[PDB]
Amino acid sequence: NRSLIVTTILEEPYVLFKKSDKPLYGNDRFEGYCIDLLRELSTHLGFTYEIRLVEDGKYGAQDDVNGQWNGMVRELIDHKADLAVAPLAITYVREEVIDFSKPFMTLGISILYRKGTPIDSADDLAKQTKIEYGAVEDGATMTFFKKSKISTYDKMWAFMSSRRQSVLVKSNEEGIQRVLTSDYAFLMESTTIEFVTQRNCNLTQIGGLIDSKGYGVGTPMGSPYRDKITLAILKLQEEGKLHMMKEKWWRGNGCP
Amino acid sequence: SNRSLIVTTILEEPYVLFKKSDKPLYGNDRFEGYCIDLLRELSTHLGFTYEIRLVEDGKYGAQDDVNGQWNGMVRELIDHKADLAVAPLAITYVREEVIDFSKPFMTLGISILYRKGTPIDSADDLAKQTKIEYGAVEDGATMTFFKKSKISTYDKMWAFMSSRRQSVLVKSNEEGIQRVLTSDYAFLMESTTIEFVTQRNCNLTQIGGLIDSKGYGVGTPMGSPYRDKITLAILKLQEEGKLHMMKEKWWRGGC
Ligand SMILES: N[C@@H](CCC(=O)O)C(=O)O
Ligand SMILES: N[C@@H](CCC(=O)O)C(=O)O
Ligand SMILES: [Cl-]
Ligand code: NA
Ligand code: NA
Ligand code: NA
Numbered sequence: 001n002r003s004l005i006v007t008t009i010l011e012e013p014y015v016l017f018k019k020s021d022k023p024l025y026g027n028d029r030f031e032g033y034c035i036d037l038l039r040e041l042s043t044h045l046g047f048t049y050e051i052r053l054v055e056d057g058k059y060g061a062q063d064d065v066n067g068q069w070n071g072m073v074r075e076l077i078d079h080k081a082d083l084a085v086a087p088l089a090i091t092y093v094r095e096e097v098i099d100f101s102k103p104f105m106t107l108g109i110s111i112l113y114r115k116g117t118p119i120d121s122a123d124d125l126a127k128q129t130k131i132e133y134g135a136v137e138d139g140a141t142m143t144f145f146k147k148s149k150i151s152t153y154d155k156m157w158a159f160m161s162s163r164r165q166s167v168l169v170k171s172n173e174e175g176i177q178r179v180l181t182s183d184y185a186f187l188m189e190s191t192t193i194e195f196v197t198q199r200n201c202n203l204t205q206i207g208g209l210i211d212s213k214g215y216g217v218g219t220p221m222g223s224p225y226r227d228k229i230t231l232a233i234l235k236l237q238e239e240g241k242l243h244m245m246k247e248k249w250w251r252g253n254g255c256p
Numbered sequence: 257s258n259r260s261l262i263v264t265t266i267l268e269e270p271y272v273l274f275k276k277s278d279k280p281l282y283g284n285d286r287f288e289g290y291c292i293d294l295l296r297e298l299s300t301h302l303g304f305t306y307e308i309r310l311v312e313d314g315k316y317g318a319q320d321d322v323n324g325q326w327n328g329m330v331r332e333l334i335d336h337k338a339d340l341a342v343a344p345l346a347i348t349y350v351r352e353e354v355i356d357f358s359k360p361f362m363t364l365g366i367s368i369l370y371r372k373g374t375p376i377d378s379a380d381d382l383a384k385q386t387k388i389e390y391g392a393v394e395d396g397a398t399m400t401f402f403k404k405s406k407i408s409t410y411d412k413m414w415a416f417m418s419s420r421r422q423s424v425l426v427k428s429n430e431e432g433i434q435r436v437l438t439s440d441y442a443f444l445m446e447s448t449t450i451e452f453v454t455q456r457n458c459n460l461t462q463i464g465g466l467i468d469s470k471g472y473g474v475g476t477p478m479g480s481p482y483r484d485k486i487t488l489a490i491l492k493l494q495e496e497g498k499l500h501m502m503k504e505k506w507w508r509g510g511c
Contacts, residue, residue, distance in 0.1 A: 077315060092491040106363045193501060234349040237469055240407060
């Protein structure tokens with residue numbers, strides 16, 4: 001049968017290009033948690049697939065003026081991909097336009113910053129401007145702040161929006177580099193913060209989780225794959241396989 | 257006017273309780289708790305009226321392996337005896353095969369409730385001994401997790417629970433807590449419930465971490481159009497901070 005087209009995005013340790021000396025081709029180019037997940041889904045559901053990086057490099061947000069979506073969300077809306085297998089947050093505005101499986105991982109927005117400071121919460125950032133802060137442009141964290149009616153988060157959005165050319169970044173990688181090279185705190189998903197702080201011993205999570213959400217496999221609205229992938233995810237979780245996959249991709253040396 | 261939806265639920269503090277009062281209470285007015293607040297929010301967002309009915313057999317729901325029949329709130333949905341189940345109802349593979357669920361409104365896992373002051377640190381420590389008995393709610397998701405598990409520790413625990421089931425499987429979380437307090441017994445319990453119980457009884461503790469991960473969702477019959485509408489409403493409530501506020505309201509109180 002026809003191979004499914006799977007849109008994804010580079011994001012360690014979910015999706016990475018494998019390191020090698022020989023050139024790699026096709027699906028063999030990729031590894032990571034989400035790649036292992038895709039392989040398990042493919043064997044459980046009995047499909048073959050072709051992995052394609054989303055061409056615009058975005059997760060997906062709606063443009064407030066013209067109403068168009070971008071990123072992996074737009075690929076699904078336009079039926080250019082059958083699945084999005086990535087650390088793609090299940091959100092209200094996305095669920096209105098695409099379908100998602102039930103979550104394979106649960107997480108929330110938090111703060112990545114340097115250690116040793118009196119900053120302990122989002123409120124501490126919101127009430128000042130000397131320490132800049134931001135988020136990935138056109139992702140779920142940005143959209144959370146843009147939409148929020150909560151005073152602290154609305155204030156933070158006004159700051160980020162004013163300073164967006166400097167403080168909104170194109171990837172988590174760029175946000176980490178800003179934390180490491182300037183006085184800057186990055187609003188980042190907690191699963192990713194866990195990965196980063198175990199490898200950057202001068203960095204830490206500040207405060208707890210600001211919200212709660214899951215990552216799910218995206219499908220076009222109405223796809224028959226959505227409910228089948230939910231069932232496969234529930235089976236992999238119950239059997240302990242998702243936990244093993246998390247340990248594989250997050251485990252490492254650590255910090256004193 | 258549209259037919260009111262029949263909502264099946266189960267008594268379980270602080271999700272669903274009878275209100276305390278001296279005058280008698282009637283109809284929906286009898287009930288309070290996190291899930292009742294959730295139901296009220298869903299009804300205003302989606303535009304329905306409802307009648308709350310406690311599940312007749314007092315069970316969450318499991319399948320009988322001899323005759324294939326389900327029980328509990330799961331069976332009420334399969335048979336279209338309820339439109340919705342709004343309860344701490346775990347989303348599980350075996351249930352998702354037969355009913356539909358919204359996306360989760362809370363995330364949790366199985367853990368262990370026991371008395372303080374013990375070297376027992378995990379399910380592995382329990383499984384390797386038989387002096388301390390252990391069990392779970394009969395015909396709920398925790399029992400079914402053990403019954404289905406191929407993981408050696410958990411399959412050893414199921415063998416023990418099954419052997420001793422008339423004594424160690426209980427009808428409700430409340431009966432499990434009473435067994436922990438009145439005998440040498442550890443209860444396999446969902447973590448959000450452990451959090452509630454241990455903040456109010458300072459002689460009790462959680463043992464170990466979470467053995468698994470799952471969510472609670474609103475149940476619907478398979479194919480219901482309410483499932484995806486309720487998912488959207490839950491996502492909106494989460495993002496606005498209302499689910500967090502509801503958790504704080506119903507779990508607030510310390511040791
Ligand atoms: N995982 C996010 C991108 C990263 C973020 O927004 O923090 C998304 O699905 O949009
Ligand atoms: N919440 C459970 C019942 C309690 C338990 O199994 O621990 C269920 O949905 O079956
Ligand atoms: Cl769903
Ligand atoms: Na990328
Ligand atoms: Na949807
Ligand atoms: Na289902």
